[PDB]
RNA sequence: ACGGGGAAUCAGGGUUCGAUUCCGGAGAGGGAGCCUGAGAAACGGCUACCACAUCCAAGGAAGGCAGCAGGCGCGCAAAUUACCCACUCCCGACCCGGGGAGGUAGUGACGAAAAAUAACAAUACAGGACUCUUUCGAGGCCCUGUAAUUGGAAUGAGUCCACUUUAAAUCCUUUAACGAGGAUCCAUUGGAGGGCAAGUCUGGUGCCAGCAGCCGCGGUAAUUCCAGCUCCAAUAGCGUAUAUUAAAGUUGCUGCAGUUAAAAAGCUCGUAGUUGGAUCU
């Protein structure tokens, strides 16, 4: 007897058919896009939509009027358009059925990084992420896949004790000072 | 049969030493390296050779 | 099996069988009757200066029996009730470290916290792992003299750096007398590793050596040597070998008092003439120019790893001359061969055997399933021998000590040894079929000149001229006859008595009947080819000789079977007929072969080596 | 050309290389 | 074969695992018998016997780790003889004492989550694309690199004061100071004949050594072995072995087959089983 937790989960579904052309350019056409590290990052976000679609096609089969499909699939819907990748008129449960892998990786923070123009690069914005330069409303984010939701669209920064924004310089600009 | 010969070829071989090379590239910018190679920029060029790896 | 209760019952037989075995030879080692539990212990890193470490383990109750150089004392501490016995070695050391490594029951290493060991160590270090590894540990001094955080990576980055040669042990340190004492009952309650030639022969450990000789002016006299006795039941009809002196007979054995018992004069065997046996090895009735050898040693060497046996064809003196000796075999396996049709007069003065597994199962039987009268183990004994020189005295006041171990019965004479020997890779120089090696084949010590050969199951055995890195080879001599198993080292001078490993292995079947051959390969040409005929330059020279080398059947280089059909120039030429078409890249070639013995250049005087270091 | 190295190495032992290399030419991208 | 709650896989149906932290049972080396007590056929209680085994002055005495550590043995196969009652709770006469229950560290690539190993700019290209020139060729307009071309700007990994954390420590979080140009502070594991992504390039060997799950490869030009280069796949992970699930409509209820591919009993009667025609507001 402990007091620990061993309830976890895989966040990812390899494929059946490993060397599948056409799967395989289609992953890193997505890859070199959004700027992300490995086939894992495509494979994590294709089970969240996934896990969507079937939660979606189960609720179908009930009717308009049952009351589990009238209150979790207005459950789901919400999330979805709270983060952004659905609209607001499109709040139908068979506008779910329309969505794709790019509207789910459209709302990273690292392309909204580059959206807002804080970058110059899908890869400068994983850097400047990672690098402890990006805060969101008032917290540091340290973490590229932070999927942005769509009240803190707007609140996307420079974290004030970097030297983008706030403005004591870094490890390099100050050693040449002192070599000044 | 004949044990005799085990480690023929293994130790036959004229031993050529592997030449030094820069280190190569990991992670992400490796992704973004091929997909520079493979999807933009494609080069307008004999095409249906698509063998990458293609000696002559 | 049948039913479940017969199954339960099944398992608890077979429990019973192997949990029963596995105690039949626990009490081999340091009972309360107590054979001294003997603990080697050497540092590999030359940081590590061993007086720092001894002392600290010293204190239950301490008993310095004095030496030469090294402090190898004993240990009592009852509040766990064992006896320790520890002795000390130095690395590199050859001498002081493979004589009393070899009837120890354990080794203690005591590794540095920085590497893992220096490049002395690691040369001791191969020795001790070809010679036979008693139960082993690791040890570390210097951990927490690191700081509290420092010491906790220092382990982990040694623990991977051993691996290579230590694939898994944890590693015991030493600080203070509180780990010691963890140290003791972790080297108390190990698992047993039975060194396989010392359980048949009854050894012992020098404690305290007395002598007094017969006669000044012939410097030779009779030792008092003093020590436990080790192996099996101890026979007084024995031989008597020390490791580095010879073999001897001895006169009179006696058991004094234990000068040192856990918990605290009598003559009783007197030697015969009637049972001893007589000590005969035989039967009594019948700079710059070595490196010119250096350069093309690198040289003739690699004439041998292109071109098998690539000689050159005798232009002057007839093919009947030059090659008389000898013979060609149709096929190299399932030719018949008699085993004793040219005796060298070397064989009329060695042994033989009816059948050598037949007589050493029977030789094995009676040291266990028979009981003798000899004194039996555990005793202190001490012993009188006839006649030792008097060098073996003062230099045990050095400090080295004097191992002397019983024989069996056929151990004293001379046979042809075949040993197993894999060679070291530490060691990068070409050595030649007859050279002079310096031999450790279980607990002798000798200079030799061997025949290297190959291991095959056939009974004809092709000599490979020099020592090649892969293949296992063997070794064949004439030495005192060694029943087998035995572990095997070679040594070799470089410069300033330094000895450099080169082999290891074991031993295979002392006998004269393995049959060594010397090739010889006669390379031609072919330079007028037809359909199936060939005219082949160059491989002899006059014509009647043609005719000599007619039955020996031809070999090519790519594979094709032929024989001589008839000769057509006056000249050197000849007709082959063959059963491919031969190729014009080709190369005809034909095998002589002949027996070949080795020398006797046998001594069993060896060197005593250096410190050994780099260069 | 590929379809003459297919048309004469299909039989030998380099027909599934030969059309793995058709096939490539045929498809293409 | 301890049973369940459950776990893996899965279109739908299924199949297999469940010793293992929750509930219930059993048992303390093997059987047996008791004392005490509300409660035990109790084993960190006792009495025997069978099996092992400790001390002994030889008359006697004491045992039971399938508790926590640790050892041996077994084996393909599994961690420290560490710190503390501060937490969660339990026992006692008790706000106070105790608890290897439990908590905290150590070992730990079982496994699951996040996630570095570089980004950017100016040049130049016998690189591509966009506007003009019939075309040569004209441009900061957008991209790319087998530029070990230059250039500062950014930063962790480490090293390390301090705070914070905690019972006290560690770790993470927060901060000084140092900390990157072959940013040598180098990413690996399998592969390149087809299944199946990716070289009939070069050297060696010559049905040998060896590769290869399968088909096949190797007999002097080897797309397959041993290597060098290059390329591919996953990527702080990747091979191998075995169990099992899908693939398997190759166990078939859904949903297979039975003339010739494996297969309808020689024929008929017959009890159980299985299945049974219309018809009532």
Redesign the pocket.
Same mark, same amino acid.
Not at chain 1, 37 to 41: A, D, Q
């Given at each position: 007897? *402990?007091?620990?937790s061993?309830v976890?989960?895989?966040?990812?579904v390899t494929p059946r058919?490993?060397?599948?052309?056409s799967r395989?350019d289609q992953?890193?056409k997505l890859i070199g896009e959004y700027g992300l #590290?490995?086939?894992?990052?495509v494979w994590?976000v294709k089970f969240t939509l996934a896990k969507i679609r079937k939660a979606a096609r189960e609720l179908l089969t009930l009717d308009e009027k049952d009351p589990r499909r009238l209150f979790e699939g207005n459950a789901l819907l919400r999330r979805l358009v709270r983060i952004g990748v659905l609209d607001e008129g499109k709040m139908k449960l068979d506008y779910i059925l329309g969505l794709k892998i790019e509207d789910f990786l459209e709302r990273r923070l690292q392309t909204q990084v580059f959206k807002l123009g804080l970058a110059?690069?899908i890869?400068?914005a #994983? *850097?400047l992420i990672?690098? +402890?330069?990006i805060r969101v409303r008032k917290q540091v984010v340290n973490?590229?896949?932070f999927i942005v939701r769509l009240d803190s669209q707007k609140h996307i920064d420079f974290s004030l +004790?970097?030297?983008y924004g706030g403005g004591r310089?870094? +490890? *390099?600009? #100050?050693?040449?000072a002192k070599k000044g | 049969?004949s044990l005799a010969? !085990?480690?023929?070829?293994?130790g /036959?071989?004229?031993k050529? !030493?592997? /030449?030094?090379?820069?280190?190569?590239?990991?992670?992400? !910018?490796?992704?973004?390296? /091929?997909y520079?190679?493979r999807f933009?920029?494609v080069?307008?060029?004999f095409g249906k050779k698509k063998?990458?790896? !293609?000696?002559? | 099996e049948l039913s479940r209760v017969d199954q339960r019952h099944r398992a608890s037989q077979l429990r019973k069988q192997?949990?029963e075995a596995?105690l039949a030879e626990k009490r081999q080692l340091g009972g309360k009757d107590g054979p001294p539990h003997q603990v080697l212990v050497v540092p590999l890193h030359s940081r590590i200066s061993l007086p720092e470490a001894m002392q600290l383990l010293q204190d239950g109750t301490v008993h310095l029996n004095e030496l030469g150089n090294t402090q190898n004392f004993m240990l009592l501490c009852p509040r766990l009730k064992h006896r320790w016995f520890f002795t000390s070695a130095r690395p590199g050391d050859l001498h002081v470290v493979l004589d009393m490594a070899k009837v120890a029951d354990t080794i203690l290493f005591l590794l540095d916290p920085l590497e893992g060991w220096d490049s002395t160590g690691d040369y001791c270090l191969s020795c001790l792992f070809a010679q036979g590894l008693p139960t082993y540990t690791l040890a570390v001094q210097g951990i927490s003299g690191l700081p509290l955080?420092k010491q906790?990576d220092t382990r982990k980055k040694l623990s991977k750096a051993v691996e290579k040669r230590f694939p898994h042990d944890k590693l015991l340190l030493l600080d203070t007398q509180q780990e010691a004492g963890?140290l003791l009952?972790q080297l108390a309650?190990?698992?047993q590793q039975h060194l396989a030639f010392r359980d048949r022969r009854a050894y012992l450990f020098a404690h305290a050596v007395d002598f007094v000789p017969s006669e000044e002016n012939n410097l030779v006299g009779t030792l008092k040597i003093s020590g436990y006795v080790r192996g099996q039941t101890l026979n007084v009809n024995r031989l008597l070998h020390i490791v580095g002196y010879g073999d001897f007979q001895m006169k009179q054995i006696d058991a004094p008092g234990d000068p040192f018992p856990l918990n605290p004069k009598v003559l009783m065997k007197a030697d015969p003439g009637r049972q001893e046996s007589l000590q005969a090895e035989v039967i009594p009735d019948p700079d710059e120019e070595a490196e010119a050898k250096m350069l093309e040693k690198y040289k003739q060497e690699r004439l041998e790893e292109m071109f098998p046996d690539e000689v050159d064809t005798p232009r002057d003196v007839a093919a009947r001359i030059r090659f008389q000796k000898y013979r060609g075999l149709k096929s190299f396996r399932t030719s018949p061969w008699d085993p004793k049709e040219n005796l060298p007069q070397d064989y009329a003065r060695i042994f033989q055997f009816q059948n050598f597994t037949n007589t050493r199962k029977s030789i094995f039987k009676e040291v266990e399933e028979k009981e003798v009268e000899g004194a039996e183990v555990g005793w202190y004994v001490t012993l009188h021998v006839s006649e030792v020189p008097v060098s073996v005295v003062e230099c045990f006041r050095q400090g080295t000590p004097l191992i002397a171990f019983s024989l069996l019965p056929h151990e004293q004479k001379m046979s042809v040894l075949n040993m197993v020997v894999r060679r070291d890779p530490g060691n990068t120089e070409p050595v030649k079929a007859k050279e002079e090696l310096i031999f450790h084949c279980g607990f002798r010590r000798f200079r030799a000149s061997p025949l290297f050969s190959q291991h095959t199951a056939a009974d004809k055995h092709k000599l490979q001229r020099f020592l090649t890195a892969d293949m296992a080879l063997v070794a064949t001599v004439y030495a005192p006859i060694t029943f087998p198993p035995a572990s095997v080292l070679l040594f070799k001078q470089k410069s300033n008595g330094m000895h450099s490993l080169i082999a290891t292995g074991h031993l295979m079947s002392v006998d004269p009947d393995r049959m060594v051959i010397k090739r010889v390969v006669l390379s031609g040409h072919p330079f007028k080819i037809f359909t199936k005929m060939a005219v082949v330059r160059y491989m002899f020279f006059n014509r009647e000789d043609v005719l000599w080398f007619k039955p020996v059947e031809l070999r090519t280089?790519?594979?094709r079977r032929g024989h001589i059909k008839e000769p057509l120039g006056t000249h050197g030429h000849m007709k082959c007929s063959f059963d491919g078409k031969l190729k014009s890249?080709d190369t005809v070639l034909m095998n002589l072969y002949k027996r070949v013995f080795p020398k006797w250049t046998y001594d069993p005087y060896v060197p005593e080596p250096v410190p050994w270091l780099k260069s | 050309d590929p379809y003459e190295?297919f048309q004469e190495?299909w039989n030998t032992?380099?027909?599934?290389?030969?059309t793995?290399?058709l096939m490539r030419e045929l498809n293409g991208g």
């Open positions: 007897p *402990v007091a620990r061993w976890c989960r895989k966040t990812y058919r490993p060397f599948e052309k395989l992953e890193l #590290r490995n086939k894992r990052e994590r110059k690069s890869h400068h #994983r *850097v990672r690098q +402890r330069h973490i590229p896949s +004790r970097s030297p310089p870094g +490890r *390099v600009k #100050r050693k040449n | 049969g010969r !085990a480690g023929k070829v293994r /036959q071989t004229p050529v !030493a592997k /030449q030094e090379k820069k280190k190569k590239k990991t992670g992400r !910018a490796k992704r973004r390296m /091929q520079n190679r933009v920029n080069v307008p060029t063998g990458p790896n !293609a000696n002559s | 192997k949990k596995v955080k906790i963890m009952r309650n190990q698992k280089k790519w594979g890249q | 190295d190495n032992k380099h027909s599934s290389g030969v793995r290399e």
